[PDB]
């Protein structure tokens, strides 16, 4: 329990940051690879828009 508690706040803050970031987007992310692809589409949209 104490180990999980120590881990807790970091995980919770991470979750909240991710939730905010994804909600800001229309998509909800589920994986580091998923984030990497979303970044790639972001770059593509950037290099298009520019």
């Amino acid at each position: 329990i104490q180990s999980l508690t120590a881990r807790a706040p970091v995980w919770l803050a991470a979750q909240d940051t991710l939730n905010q970031l994804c909600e800001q987007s229309g998509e909800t992310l589920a994986s580091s690879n998923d984030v990497t692809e979303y970044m790639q589409q972001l770059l593509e949209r950037e290099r298009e828009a520019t």
């Binding site: 706040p9 919770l12 803050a13 909240d16 939730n19 905010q20």
Partner: protein
Amino acid sequence: EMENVQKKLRKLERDYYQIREQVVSAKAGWCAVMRMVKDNGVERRLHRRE
């Protein structure tokens, strides 16, 4: 010998009693703020569970 422990039980009981009134009053106070804040304030803005 046991009567002394009975008196200690009485002390503990009065302490419990005090704590109980504290908790019930706190919930009474909370009730209304939950009711109002359910207008999307608590959803993710105020409830910074971190």
